[PDB]
């Protein structure tokens, strides 16, 4: 198929970031550069941003840039 495993990979990358410990939220385009998602079409990224990023409970949106919610998990 197309445009599903890539989203799964992004979410896994977020867990990897959280094992890293970088609380600072990151830009989606920079995440794509790190995960080699440049090849993917832009329209799929826009659909992800509008719908899937908000639906994912772990993901959070701050100052127009998407990252996990540091409140959801126990600290």
């Amino acid at each position: 198929g197309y445009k599903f495993g890539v989203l799964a990979k992004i979410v896994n990358y977020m867990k990897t970031r959280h094992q890293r410990g970088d609380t600072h939220p990151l830009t989606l385009d920079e995440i794509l550069d790190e995960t080699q998602h440049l090849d993917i079409g832009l329209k799929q990224k826009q659909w992800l941003m509008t719908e899937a990023l908000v639906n994912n409970p772990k993901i959070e949106v701050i100052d127009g840039k998407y990252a996990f919610k540091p409140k959801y998990n126990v600290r």
Binding site: G1, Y2, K3, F4, G5, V6, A8, K9, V11, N12, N56
Partner: protein, 88 residues
């Protein structure tokens, strides 16, 4: 001439040669295994563990660990309870 004494059956030696040449499946890195799993889920929504093992070419225990980390077993009317590759 029937049941002539033989050290090992021809089919058995051929199968053993095939097994030895193929070698046991190796435990690849989590990143690559995860990427292959996500690619497979794109092709098919629902996968059985037996065929997923063939697709991934990884040890059953290691693949089960990685799949328990993200995917979840759903009890279903297809025929039996099977894995779901969608993390949620």
């Amino acid at each position: 001439t029937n049941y002539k004494p033989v050290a090992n059956h021809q089919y058995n030696i051929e199968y053993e040669r095939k097994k030895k040449e193929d070698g046991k499946r190796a435990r690849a890195d989590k990143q690559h295994v995860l990427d292959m799993l996500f690619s497979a889920f794109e092709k098919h929504q629902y996968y059985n563990l037996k065929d997923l093992v063939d697709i991934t070419k990884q040890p059953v225990v290691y693949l089960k660990e990685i799949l328990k980390e993200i995917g979840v077993q759903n009890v279903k009317g297809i025929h039996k309870n099977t894995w779901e590759l969608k993390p949620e």
